[PDB]
Write an enzyme that holds these catalytic residues in place. Structure first.
Site, short mmCIF file in Angstrom:
data_model
loop_
_atom_site.label_atom_id
_atom_site.label_comp_id
_atom_site.label_asym_id
_atom_site.label_seq_id
_atom_site.Cartn_x
_atom_site.Cartn_y
_atom_site.Cartn_z
N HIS A 99 67.08 12.66 48.31
CA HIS A 99 67.87 12.02 46.88
C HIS A 99 66.59 10.83 46.63
CE1 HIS A 99 71.94 13.35 48.04
NE2 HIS A 99 71.40 14.20 47.36
N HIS A 108 69.69 13.35 53.59
CA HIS A 108 71.04 13.79 54.36
C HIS A 108 70.64 15.07 55.00
CE1 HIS A 108 73.26 10.93 51.75
NE2 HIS A 108 72.55 11.40 50.91
N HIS A 119 73.36 4.66 57.98
CA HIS A 119 73.91 5.80 57.65
C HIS A 119 72.91 7.12 57.34
CE1 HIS A 119 77.32 3.44 56.95
NE2 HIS A 119 76.64 2.36 56.10
N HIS A 140 66.00 8.64 50.09
CA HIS A 140 66.56 8.92 51.41
C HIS A 140 67.13 10.44 51.71
CE1 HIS A 140 69.78 8.49 48.80
NE2 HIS A 140 70.73 9.26 49.46
N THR A 165 77.07 9.66 46.51
CA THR A 165 77.57 10.55 47.56
C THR A 165 78.23 9.57 48.67
OG1 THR A 165 75.67 11.07 48.54
CG2 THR A 165 76.36 12.65 46.90
N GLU A 198 74.17 18.27 50.86
CA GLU A 198 75.41 17.84 50.10
C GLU A 198 75.66 18.75 49.26
OE1 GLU A 198 74.74 13.61 49.45
OE2 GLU A 198 75.86 13.36 51.27
N1 LIG Z 1 73.51 9.63 48.21
S1 LIG Z 1 73.10 9.10 46.63
O1 LIG Z 1 74.06 9.35 45.69
O2 LIG Z 1 71.74 9.26 46.40
C1 LIG Z 1 73.12 7.46 46.87
C2 LIG Z 1 73.83 6.64 47.65
C3 LIG Z 1 73.71 5.22 47.60
C4 LIG Z 1 72.67 4.94 46.86
CL1 LIG Z 1 72.07 3.47 46.41
S2 LIG Z 1 71.94 6.31 46.21
ZN LIG Z 2 72.02 10.69 49.05
#
Ligand SMILES: NS(=O)(=O)c1ccc(Cl)s1
Ligand SMILES: [Zn+2]
Ligand code: NA
Ligand code: NA
EC number: 4.2.1.1
Length: 258
Positions: free
Chosen positions: A117, A94, A62, A92, A196, A104
């Protein structure tokens, strides 16, 4: 079938396996800058990353995650809107297929080329898994990326991506300093939201920095050479791995700056 970012498994489908996708505190959102209210009770954000211990980088199909040792208070986020200490577990990004999309969160409907993030969990809950059962379990620091000059502190990430091209690959990734990914200012917006990606859990205090970082076109081009697929499967470039803005519902976005 598995969730993803394609026509048949993307954000419009997620609610069938994760019904909270239609919940009351989903992320991301559009940040309407004129509606966001300055809150004088907010504190400066305290980012203490001096003792961070990165361990590994993983292509999870992902995005890619840079993982940290979270067995002690080595890299923590305090202050801001938070009433506790939150430990860094991973970061990570996006990003888009084109420079005009990829973030996002949006700012007055503007999309950035990518969004970072930094994911942290509230130490009063003991471990990440227990924290994601709580309404104040997580704090995510979000940072926008625009394309312009290179970000030197990102280059070590860029350069290892060749070794984690496909889903399931990991590589050693020690001694990475996440302070090299921050902008100058720590001014921010904050609101209550969610992860997210599936499972979309509503555990997050979002802290979104006002100032983007600038990365070069070559740096984001290298993100776009990653693969969603595993080794030996047909190649599908890892691009457009973002969820669009969700309904704000009964929420207020607060600003740390006037
Ligand atoms: N994309 S996010 O809300 O930062 C997130 C997705 C999965 C995680 Cl563990 S932290
Ligand atoms: Zn994220
Ligand atoms: Na408001
Ligand atoms: Na330890």
């Amino acid at each position: 079938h598995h969730w993803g970012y394609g026509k048949h498994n993307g954000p419009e489908h997620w609610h069938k396996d994760f019904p909270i996708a239609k919940g009351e505190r989903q992320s991301p959102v559009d940040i309407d800058t004129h509606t966001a209210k300055y809150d004088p009770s907010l504190k400066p954000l305290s980012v203490s990353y001096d003792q961070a211990t990165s361990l590994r980088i993983l292509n999870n199909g992902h995005a890619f995650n840079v993982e940290f040792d979270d067995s002690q208070d080595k890299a923590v986020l305090k202050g801001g809107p938070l009433d506790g200490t939150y430990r860094l577990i991973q970061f990570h990004f996006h990003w888009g297929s084109l420079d005009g999309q990829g973030s996002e969160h949006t700012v007055d409907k503007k999309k950035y080329a990518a969004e970072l993030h930094l994911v942290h969990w509230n130490t009063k809950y003991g471990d990440f898994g227990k924290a994601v059962q709580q309404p104040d379990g997580l704090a995510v620091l979000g940072i926008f990326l625009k394309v312009g000059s290179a970000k030197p502190g990102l280059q070590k990430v860029v350069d290892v991506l060749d070794s984690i091209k496909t889903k399931g690959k990991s590589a050693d990734f020690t001694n990475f300093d996440p302070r090299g990914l921050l902008p100058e200012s720590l001014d921010y917006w904050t609101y209550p939201g969610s992860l997210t990606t599936p499972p979309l859990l509503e555990c997050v205090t979002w802290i979104v920095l006002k100032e983007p970082i600038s990365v070069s076109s070559e740096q984001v081009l290298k993100f776009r050479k990653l693969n969603f697929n595993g080794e030996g499967e047909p190649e599908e470039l890892m691009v457009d791995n973002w969820r669009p803005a969700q309904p704000l519902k009964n929420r207020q976005i607060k600003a740390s700056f006037k």
